[PDB]
């Protein structure tokens, strides 16, 4: 359709969103490959990004992809995919699947006091 | 003439409202919310009464829900007149400032007739409203609201198509969609930048689900989009007021749980239980169960939320007031980067900044 | 349910372009503003002539506090201290003792009008309608201590304004 | 007993930061006196700075003196720019305050305050 | 409303809209300042039978918050809520 | 039950409990408690050492998208050893959700600043210092924002009195406004209004 | 009717008169002491005693909702007339 | 390691901003409040309270209110346990005294003893 | 009973849409009038 | 009273030239109205 404006300021119109989304999802998969499999974050994020890769691969149209991905405009999907890739890099660096660092005191979350 | 750093200093009106709430009961803390935003006086109590009723696990009667929306929407006409006209006063066009003040004086009589005060009504209370509308009040609302559509077109004529107003407005105060969300912005800030977000449509409260209206959103995120969104919100307020006047249901104005809302004066002088409950409610106050909640409404400035914490007694443990203008002033350094020193009187203008709720 | 304000694409034809050029050169919208100002010059102004004219007010109006009396000469207040307990500004100070005939009456009823926020909690918490937020509003004083009312000033205010406070409460009490 | 430090790992780093803050305050005091057209001399202001620094000197917790260093640095930064008035600078000199009784006899004469 | 016809004509020409049909000054069309006394209705619990407070105890129905996890299989990844529907354009005035 | 009691929501309770379980099982390093209130509000009590990652997760996950920051509230409870309760409120626009993240912190130990997650907190926690003394490390510009410049102490702490320790009055001898010890014309009358009877049986603490 | 203490200062209905050695009377010189000339006990002292024929009477102050809450007075004791606690009116049984 | 072993005394008296006159001449009192004898309720006797001694309050020369000069007269704090209140008292440098929790002793009640055959605990009337 | 109620037929319709008059002479005609005034003054 | 004028200006008062011994030929006051007329002036009720 070659949408003139995406409706949001600072968000330029992506002329080729299909290859961009596919390369972002594959990059997310390669980044998530290094996470150990027993972490639930790897399983959950791999599942949702594989579902998103399947739905973005099985349809050529852009308007139906926007209306059935439930992510708003396809540029918003690209932005949230980039943010999820940044999250995957940060969780690679941070390793949050380890056990609890410190137990709280017994009277810490007791309300009312 | 140009700007790279603009650091505002606040605290000139710091009264410490949210500490004084801790030493007063829930009913005694109700007039405090009137004086936080003194141009949205009747909208802040709707946020506080929704917080107490959520903790108390009660709901207002159906007649009380329509009154709060009707007088909430008349306060949007209160606030947005202060928004545009003082923004025009700061820029320099003083002519429509006095035109709308006669209209704002006319809706001050509506506040005085139902509650008794022009500004600080203390009308909306947890459990309903304090008093009913006087007889023939809604007849006077309709005859005023019929003629109010000309005044918005009167105000729009001298400002929208004016080339002098446009040249001060069309390219100063531009945000993007992503940085507006990260800056805690709400209200016209998100709507002006093109983000579709309105609390009355997504997370509705008392009877806003039933009514039908439109949410005007911007195209470029400049000050001119934020001026047009404020003028169009006057039109949608008239649309709600016309709907509310024809769909006011019968019933009581207060919740019939007399342990929360006080009983009537005729029944407190005849029944024993009504006199006991009148004694404890006006001296001790009702016991709010422990639990922390964050209830946010759509104020005309933005998202107004109250974080209320109850310790089990009749007094709040902690009552944080979230100001829509507090986060809006936090972005002022980024707002005026690269603009001229005379543009800050318009960048302050396009955000509904009132120094009562900013400094608490 | 959402409308695009300021998303009207201007016409690119010769007619609209020439009309916009004529608007820019001939100041046509400025002429419209001049015409609106001329039309709003000739209207009758809404200026009421104070103090010879007064603004419209309601019988529920909250103003100067006053202490009422029964229609037998006895003071209405029974020193129950509900108004000083409900007062959000703590402007009301009550000190009481049993008087000569054994009736429970006040000895000191002080209202700090510089402290009071005129919220009307005392006029609704009072079980005998003793204290009333009366209709008076023209009581500005030249000295700070003249706004610190004792029991005698409030009783004088009640005796002065009872002839209209009784009518107002008679017209209003069915809403309470 | 193991805690997370703020800026200083031990007492020596906190002492060094105390030294640096005192050096900056001693640099600023003549400029502060001249800027606000103060009635005090330079040495009186430096004596006041020393008197605060020695009044707040009986605490040995590194985190406590680190927080006090941070608060003193905020005070120094607020005096760097023209953010305070003459009143906020002159508040440290309790001049209009009447001198309270200190010995037991005068405190007995004036009231019940111990 | 008491303005003369030539002043009304000049005013209507200068404004471009009919100003007498919608006057901003209030007149005798307003409601009167005195009203007949009203009789308010009662609430839904103004009853003499089956009106026990335990059947409508709103305050006492509160519960402590349910501890989902405390520190003393292949389920799908779950969002806090279903995603929001796309807003539809206003058919009354889309402003396009 | 029907007319005068607020109706209860159960599908929102189920969805919030499911997302709380998902969050608690996706970040086991820092989460300590997850609770869903009776009025369908989700609260996550996490360790202070995970103030940065967890919120960053909620900023950037595909299934959370908590883009907006609503509140940054400090609650002072003197009966605990970590007397300060720092509470973040997050709003997700895509899924239309609200979440609450709670952490504990005493007077001396600092907490890492959340400026890089949400820039609005760049002001908010600043006010927290000006009201509580909770130091926020790596803050860009942390100073007082609401109180007076010569103000000593933090007002919102529960041991701080209602009226302050100093009052301002103008003196003609020094031609200046000056601070004096507080002497009220009338003492603030403390009203004992706590009921001696139990109000809610479901909220009863077990005996010692 | 008010009284007159011999310092020249009027007497309030409570009974508050500044002494001869009280300096606070300097706040009155050049001005006036505002008192109430209608004493409540003297105004109710001239009210007649209502004679009824019932053992239990009910008083609400007159006007219904504009008076004090309704209170029941027992008139069994013929020695003392039953006086209402709110309005101060007193009722007497004929028997 | 990012952790430092500090065994120093937990004292924050210089951080609270209190003047010295109100941290050395005041007596903090930690106690369980007594039950009001006109009521049978005991819900107010479940939490420890911290209070300060009453200072001088005089009469206003103008109009007669209770004018005070003590800023901590309306400062009463609530604590769940005794040791936490003791820690909070030691933390702010207040000299403090503690009164123990006066629990009521378990009485022995019997309805039949009002109608005993020979004991002195008979009821004279009912 | 008696309370503040809308009339049994409801209130009348209330206008809320934007309504601006829009008025003009054409630019070509205005420039022709200016040219005519110029030539008359010059003559 | 003049009911043809717009609301606010329809009722008005001309003050006396002497009230309680004060020569008030020019000095008019807003509190110079007895309560029975203070009802009618400020539009408490329609009945004088
Ligand atoms: S109106 Fe309100 S603030 Fe004023 S005295 Fe009455 S209760 Fe107090
Ligand atoms: S509420 Fe009324 S009766 Fe009670 S003390 Fe106050 S004025 Fe007197
Ligand atoms: Zn009586």
- CATH number for the domain including C156? 3.30.70.3270
Coil vs helix vs strand at C135: coil
Q: How far is I17 from chain E (nearest CA, A)?
A: 9
Q: Which of C139, C89, C153 is nearest to C116 (CA)?
A: C89
Cα separation, B217 vs B213, whole angstroms: 13
Nearest residue by C-alpha to atom 2 in ligand 1 = C119
Ligand-binding site membership of G36 (annotated): no
CA B205 to centroid of chain Cα atoms: 14
Coil vs helix vs strand at C96: strand
Say if residues B321 and B295 touch (Cβ distance below 8 Å). Answer: no
Say if residues A35 and A41 touch (Cβ distance below 8 Å). Answer: yes
Burial class (CB in 10 A: 0-12, 13-18, 19+), B332: middle
**Helix B62-91 vs helix B95-114: angle between axes, to the nearest 10 degrees?**
160
Give yes or no for A105 touching B (CB within 8 A). no
Nearest residue by C-alpha to atom 4 in ligand 2 = C80
- Tokens 């001696």 correspond to F196
Cα separation, D73 vs F143, whole angstroms: 10
Nearest residue by C-alpha to atom 8 in ligand 2 = C77
Which helix (DSSP H) or strand (DSSP E) does residue A68 occupy? helix A63-69
Largest Cα separation within chain E, whole Å, is 87
Nearest residue by C-alpha to atom 1 in ligand 2 = C126
The count of other CB atoms within 10 Å of the CB of residue A2 is: 6
- The pair of three-digit structure tokens given for residue I27, joined into one six-digit string: 């630019």
Ligand 3 centroid–CA G52 distance in Å is 15
Helices of type H across chain G: 40-45
Q: Is C94 in the pocket of ligand 2 (CB under 6 A)?
A: yes
Cα torsion for B45, B51, B56, B62, to the nearest 10°? 60
Count Cα neighbours of A18 within 13 Å in the Cβ-side half-sphere: 12
Method: cryo-EM
Q: Which of B307, B205, B131 is nearest to F6 (CA)?
A: B205
Count Cα neighbours of B101 within 13 Å in the Cβ-side half-sphere: 11
Q: Where are the beta strands (DSSP E) in G1-95?
A: 50-52, 56-59, 71-74, 82-83, 90-93
Cα separation, A78 vs A18, whole angstroms: 10
Ligand 2 centroid–CA C151 distance in Å is 12
- Resolution of the determined structure in angstroms stands at 3.9
Q: How far is J33 from chain C (nearest CA, A)?
A: 10
Give yes or no for E82 touching F (CB within 8 A). yes
Q: Is C96 in the pocket of ligand 2 (CB under 6 A)?
A: no
Q: How far is E40 from chain C (nearest CA, A)?
A: 8
β-bridge pairing F111-112 and B124-125: unpaired
Cα separation, B269 vs G68, whole angstroms: 7
Where do breaks (C to N over 2.5 Å) occur in chain E, by preceding residue number? 72
Cα separation, B69 vs B112, whole angstroms: 18
List % helix, strand, coil for chain E (3-state, nearest 5): 20, 5, 75
Whichever domain contains G64, its CATH number is 2.60.260.40
Contact: F197, H68; criterion CB under 8 Å = no
Contact: A72, E86; criterion CB under 8 Å = yes
Say if residues H59 and H65 touch (Cβ distance below 8 Å). Answer: yes
Say if residues D113 and H22 touch (Cβ distance below 8 Å). Answer: no
Say if residues A72 and A16 touch (Cβ distance below 8 Å). Answer: no
Query: DSSP secondary structure string, D44-83?
Result: HHHHHHHHHHHHS-S---HHHHHHHHHHHHHHHHHHHTT-
Cα separation, B249 vs B251, whole angstroms: 7
Q: Is C113 in the pocket of ligand 1 (CB under 6 A)?
A: no
- What's the DSSP call for residue F10? S
Contact: C70, G61; criterion CB under 8 Å = yes
**Helix B62-91 vs helix B41-56: angle between axes, to the nearest 10 degrees?**
140
Cα separation, C94 vs C107, whole angstroms: 8
Ligand having the closest approach to the CA of C78: 2
Domain that holds residue G81: 41-93
Ligand-binding site membership of C83 (annotated): yes
**Cis preceding linkage at B293, omega within 30:** no
Cα separation, A86 vs F57, whole angstroms: 10
**In terms of residues, how long is chain I?**
43
**H48 to chain A: nearest residue by CA?**
A113
Nearest residue by C-alpha to atom 5 in ligand 1 = C116
| Residue C71 neighbours by CB under 8 Å, 6+ apart | G62
Cα separation, B32 vs H97, whole angstroms: 38
Distance (Å) of CA F46 to CA A97, A108, B53, C35, E7: 14, 11, 29, 65, 74
Three-state secondary structure string covering F101-129: EEEEECCCCCEECCCCCCCCHHHHHHHHH
Coil vs helix vs strand at G60: coil
**Cis preceding linkage at C51, omega within 30:** yes
Domains annotated on chain H, with CATH: 20-114 (3.30.160.190)
Q: Which of B216, D88, C79, J44 is nearest to F178 (CA)?
A: D88
CB burial readout J19-42, b (16+ within 10 A) else e: eeeeeeeeeeeeebbebeebbbbb
A·E CB contacts under 8 A: 14
**Chain B contact set for C82 (CB, 8 A):** 279, 282-283
Q: Is C165 in the pocket of ligand 2 (CB under 6 A)?
A: no
Contact: F202, E64; criterion CB under 8 Å = yes
CA B53 to centroid of chain Cα atoms: 18
Mutational pocket test of ligand 2: of C78, C84, C97, the residue with most ligand atoms within 8 Å of the beta carbon: C78
Domain that holds residue C90: 64-175
CA F117 to centroid of chain Cα atoms: 18
Cα separation, D87 vs F194, whole angstroms: 43
Which helix (DSSP H) or strand (DSSP E) does residue B280 occupy? helix B272-281
Which helix (DSSP H) or strand (DSSP E) does residue C24 occupy? helix C14-26
Q: Is C117 in the pocket of ligand 1 (CB under 6 A)?
A: yes
β-bridge pairing F111-112 and F97-105: unpaired
Ligand-binding site membership of C65 (annotated): no
Q: Which numbered atom of ligand 1 lies nearest the CA of C118?
A: 1
Coil vs helix vs strand at B166: helix
CA D3 to centroid of chain Cα atoms: 27
**Helix A17-32 vs helix A40-57: angle between axes, to the nearest 10 degrees?**
160
- The pair of three-digit structure tokens given for residue B308, joined into one six-digit string: 């209320």
Ligand-binding site membership of G59 (annotated): yes
**Helix A40-57 vs helix F11-26: angle between axes, to the nearest 10 degrees?**
110
Contact: G69, B268; criterion CB under 8 Å = yes
List % helix, strand, coil for chain D (3-state, nearest 5): 60, 0, 35
Q: Which of C159, B267, A87 is nearest to J35 (CA)?
A: C159
Cα separation, H92 vs H106, whole angstroms: 38
- What's the DSSP call for residue F154? -
- What's the DSSP call for residue E37? P
Cα separation, F200 vs B259, whole angstroms: 14
Q: How far is C157 from chain B (nearest CA, A)?
A: 20
Q: Which of H3, H12, H15 sits opposite D3 (nearest CB)?
A: H3
- The pair of three-digit structure tokens given for residue E69, joined into one six-digit string: 């996890």
Phi and psi angles of residue D10, each rounded to the nearest 5 degrees, phi first: -140, -170
- The pair of three-digit structure tokens given for residue D93, joined into one six-digit string: 């000199």
The count of other CB atoms within 10 Å of the CB of residue E4 is: 9
Coil vs helix vs strand at B292: strand
């Amino acid at each position: 359709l070659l949408k003139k404006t995406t409706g949001l300021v600072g968000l330029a119109v992506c002329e080729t969103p299909h290859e961009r989304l596919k390369i972002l999802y594959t990059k997310i998969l390669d980044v998530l490959g290094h996470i150990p499999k027993n972490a639930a974050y790897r399983k959950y994020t791999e599942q949702i990004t594989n579902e998103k890769l399947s739905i973005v691969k099985a349809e050529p149209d852009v308007k139906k992809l926007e209306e059935q991905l439930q992510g708003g405009q396809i540029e918003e999907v690209i932005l949230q995919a980039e943010n999820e890739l940044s999250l995957a890099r940060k969780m690679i660096q941070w390793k949050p699947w380890e056990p609890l660092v410190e137990e709280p005191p017994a009277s810490q979350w007791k309300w009312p006091i | 003439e140009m700007v790279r750093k603009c650091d505002p200093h606040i605290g000139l009106l710091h009264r410490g409202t949210e500490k004084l709430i801790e030493y007063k009961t829930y009913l005694q803390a109700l007039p405090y919310f009137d004086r936080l935003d003194y141009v949205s006086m009747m909208c802040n109590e709707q946020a506080y009464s929704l917080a107490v009723e959520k903790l108390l696990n009660i709901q207002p009667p159906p007649r009380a829900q329509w009154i709060r929306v009707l007088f909430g929407e008349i306060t949007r006409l209160l606030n947005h007149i202060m928004a545009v006209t003082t923004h025009a006063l700061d820029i320099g066009a003083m002519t429509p400032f006095f035109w709308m003040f006669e209209e704002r004086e006319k809706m001050f009589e509506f506040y005085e007739r139902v509650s008794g005060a022009r500004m600080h009504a203390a009308y909306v209370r947890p459990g309903g409203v304090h008093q009913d509308l006087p007889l023939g009040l809604m007849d006077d609302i309709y005859e005023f609201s019929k003629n109010f559509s000309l005044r918005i077109d009167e105000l729009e004529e001298m400002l929208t198509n004016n080339r002098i107003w446009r040249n001060r407005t069309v390219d100063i105060g531009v945000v993007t969609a992503e940085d507006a969300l990260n800056y805690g912005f709400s209200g016209v800030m998100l709507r002006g930048s093109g983000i579709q977000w309105d609390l009355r449509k997504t997370q509705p409260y008392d009877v806003y689900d039933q009514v039908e209206f439109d949410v005007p959103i911007g195209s470029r995120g400049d000050c001119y989009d934020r001026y047009l969104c404020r003028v169009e919100e006057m039109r949608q307020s008239i649309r709600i007021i016309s709907q509310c006047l024809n769909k006011m249901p019968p019933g009581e104005i207060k919740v019939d749980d007399a342990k929360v809302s006080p009983p009537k004066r005729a029944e407190m002088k005849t029944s024993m239980e009504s006199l006991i409950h009148h004694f404890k409610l006006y001296t001790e106050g009702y016991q709010v169960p422990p639990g922390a909640t964050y209830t946010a409404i759509e104020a005309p400035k933005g998202e107004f939320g109250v974080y209320l914490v109850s310790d089990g007694s009749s007094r709040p443990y902690r009552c944080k007031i979230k100001a829509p203008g507090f986060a809006h002033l936090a972005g002022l350094d980024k707002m005026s980067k690269g603009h001229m020193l005379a543009d800050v009187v318009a960048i302050i203008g396009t955000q509904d900044i009132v120094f009562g709720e900013v400094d608490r | 349910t959402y409308k695009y304000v300021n998303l009207r694409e201007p016409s690119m034809d010769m007619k609209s372009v020439t009309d916009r050029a004529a608007q820019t050169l001939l100041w046509t919208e400025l002429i419209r503003g001049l015409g609106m100002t001329l039309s709003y010059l000739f209207r009758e102004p809404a200026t009421i002539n104070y103090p010879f004219e007064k603004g419209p007010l309601s019988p529920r109006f909250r103003g100067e506090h006053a202490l009422r009396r029964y229609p037998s000469g006895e003071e209405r207040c029974i020193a129950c201290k509900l108004c000083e307990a409900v007062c959000p500004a703590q402007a009301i100070t009550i000190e009481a003792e049993p008087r000569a005939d054994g009736s429970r009456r006040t000895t000191r009823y002080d209202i700090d009008m510089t402290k009071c926020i005129y919220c009307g909690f005392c006029q609704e918490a009072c079980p005998v309608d003793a204290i009333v937020e009366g209709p008076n509003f023209e009581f500005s004083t030249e000295t700070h201590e003249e706004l610190l009312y004792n029991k005698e000033k409030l009783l004088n205010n009640g005796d002065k304004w009872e002839a209209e406070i009784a009518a107002n409460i008679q017209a209003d009490y069915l809403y309470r | 007993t193991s805690v997370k430090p703020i800026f200083s790992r031990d007492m020596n780093e906190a002492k060094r930061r105390v030294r640096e803050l005192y050096r900056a305050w001693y640099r600023e005091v003549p400029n502060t006196v001249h800027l606000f057209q103060l009635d005090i001399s330079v040495k009186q202001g430096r004596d006041k700075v020393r008197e605060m620094f020695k009044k707040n000197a009986h605490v040995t917790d590194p985190r406590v003196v680190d927080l006090l260093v941070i608060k003193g640095k905020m005070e120094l930064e607020e005096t760097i720019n023209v953010w305070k008035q003459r009143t906020h600078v002159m508040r440290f000199f309790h001049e209009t305050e009447a001198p309270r009784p200190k010995d037991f006899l005068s405190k007995f004469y004036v009231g019940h305050d111990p | 409303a008491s303005a003369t016809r030539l002043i009304q004509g000049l005013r209507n020409w200068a404004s471009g809209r009919d100003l007498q049909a919608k006057l901003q000054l209030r007149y005798q069309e307003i409601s009167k300042r005195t009203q007949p006394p009203p009789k308010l209705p009662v609430g839904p619990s103004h009853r003499l039978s089956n009106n026990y407070y335990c059947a409508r105890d709103g305050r006492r129905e509160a519960m402590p918050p349910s501890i989902v996890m405390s520190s003393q299989s292949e389920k799908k990844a779950v969002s806090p809520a279903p995603p929001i529907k796309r807003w539809e354009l206003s058919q009354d005035e889309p402003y396009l | 039950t029907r007319p005068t009691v607020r109706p209860r929501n159960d599908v929102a309770h189920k969805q919030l409990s499911a997302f709380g379980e998902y969050v608690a099982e996706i970040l086991p390093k820092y989460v300590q408690q997850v609770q869903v209130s009776c009025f369908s509000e989700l609260e996550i009590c996490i360790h202070p050492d995970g103030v940065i990652p967890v919120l960053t997760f909620l900023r950037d996950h595909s299934n959370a998208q908590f883009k907006s920051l609503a509140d940054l509230t400090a609650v002072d409870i003197p009966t605990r050893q970590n007397r300060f309760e720092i509470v973040y409120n997050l709003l997700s626009l895509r899924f239309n959700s609200r979440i609450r993240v709670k952490t504990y912190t005493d007077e001396l130990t600092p907490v890492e600043s959340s400026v890089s997650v949400y820039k609005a907190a760049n002001w908010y926690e600043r006010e927290i210092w000006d009201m509580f003394g909770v130091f926020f490390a790596n803050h860009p510009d942390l100073r007082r924002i609401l109180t007076d410049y010569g103000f000593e102490g933090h007002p919102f702490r529960k041991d701080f009195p209602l009226s302050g320790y100093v009052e301002l009055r103008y003196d003609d001898e020094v031609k200046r406004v000056v601070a004096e010890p507080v002497e009220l014309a009338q003492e603030f009358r403390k009203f004992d209004l706590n009921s001696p009877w139990e109000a809610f049986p479901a909220y009863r603490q077990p005996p010692e | 009717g008010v009284r007159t203490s011999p310092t020249g200062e009027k007497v309030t209905h409570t009974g508050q008169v500044y002494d001869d050695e009280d300096y606070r009377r300097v706040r009155f010189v050049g001005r006036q002491k505002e008192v109430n000339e209608n004493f409540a006990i003297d105004l109710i002292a001239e009210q007649p005693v209502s004679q009824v024929g019932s053992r239990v009477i009910s008083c609400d102050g007159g006007g219904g909702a504009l008076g004090h809450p309704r209170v029941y007075i027992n008139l069994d004791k013929e020695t003392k007339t039953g006086t209402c606690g709110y309005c101060g009116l007193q009722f007497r049984q004929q028997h | 390691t990012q952790l430092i072993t500090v065994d120093e005394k937990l004292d924050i008296t210089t951080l609270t901003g209190v003047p010295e006159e109100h941290i050395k001449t005041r007596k903090a009192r930690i106690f369980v409040p007594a039950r009001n004898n006109m009521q049978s309720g005991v819900n107010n006797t479940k939490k420890w309270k911290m209070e300060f001694d009453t200072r001088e309050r005089w009469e206003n020369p103008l109009m007669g209110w209770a004018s005070t000069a003590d800023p901590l007269s309306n400062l009463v704090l609530t604590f769940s346990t005794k040791e936490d209140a003791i820690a909070f008292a030691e933390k702010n440098g207040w000299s403090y005294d503690v009164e123990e929790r006066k629990v009521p002793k378990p009485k022995s009640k019997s309805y039949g003893a009002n109608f005993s055959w020979n004991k002195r605990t008979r009821v004279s009337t009912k | 009973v008696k309370q503040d109620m809308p009339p049994v037929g409801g209130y009348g319709p209330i206008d809320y849409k934007r309504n601006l008059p829009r008025r003009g002479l054409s630019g070509y005609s205005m420039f022709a009038v200016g040219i005519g005034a110029l030539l008359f003054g010059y003559w | 009273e003049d009911n043809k004028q717009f609301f606010g200006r329809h009722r008005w008062v001309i003050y006396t030239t002497e009230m309680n011994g004060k020569n008030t030929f020019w000095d008019v006051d807003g509190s110079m109205v007895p309560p029975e007329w203070h009802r009618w002036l400020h539009c408490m009720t329609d009945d004088p």
